[PDB]
């Protein structure tokens, strides 16, 4: 499923992500934009052999099990395939764990490089929320 911008903002808000760990909804929409272009089915292999999954490109080295990432963990206790669903519940619940891990949203390199410090409220501007 490819979400619309405001559609995803609304879904993230319904699942409790708005201001989660102090990160406003626009931060989450911005991260999803540059991680997946709002596509729940996005996957991307990493050089280390792990894979990133879903709207927030959650990595198999630590957070989900895909059966092919040697030495990895599954700290969200989910198959990585769950992160590709049209229902964003699994991605949101796992993202809450990731953003609580110590470095905030810097865990998402693309958030640090493309969203951090910018006018992230633009990503929810105009949306009925
Ligand atoms: Cl957009
Ligand atoms: Cl917010
Ligand atoms: Cl915002
Ligand atoms: Cl594995
Ligand atoms: Cl584990
Ligand atoms: Cl599994
Ligand atoms: Cl959803
Ligand atoms: Cl923080
Ligand atoms: Na894993």
From Swiss-Prot:
Example of a GO MF term: beta-N-acetylglucosaminidase activity
EC number: 3.2.1.17
Keyword Signal: yes
One example of a Gene Ontology biological process annotation: defense response to Gram-positive bacterium
Location in or out of the cell: Secreted
Active site: 35, 52
Binding site for substrate: 101
Tissues and organs where the protein is expressed, per its UniProt entry: In the egg white and polymorphonuclear leukocytes.
Assigned protein family: Belongs to the glycosyl hydrolase 22 family.
Listed name of the protein: Lysozyme C
């Amino acid at each position: 499923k490819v979400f619309g911008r405001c559609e995803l903002a609304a879904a993230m808000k319904r699942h409790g992500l708005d201001n989660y760990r102090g990160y406003s909804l626009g931060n989450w929409v911005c991260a999803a934009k540059f991680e997946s272009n709002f596509n729940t089915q996005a996957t991307n292999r990493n050089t280390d052999g792990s894979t990133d999954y879903g709207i927030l490109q959650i990595n198999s080295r630590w957070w989900c099990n895909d059966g092919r990432t040697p030495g990895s963990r599954n700290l969200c206790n989910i198959p990585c395939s769950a992160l590709l669903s049209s229902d964003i519940t699994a991605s949101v619940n796992c993202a809450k764990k990731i953003v609580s891990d110590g470095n905030g949203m810097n865990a998402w390199v693309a958030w640090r490089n493309r969203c951090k410090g910018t006018d992230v409220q633009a990503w929810i501007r105009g949306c009925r929320l």
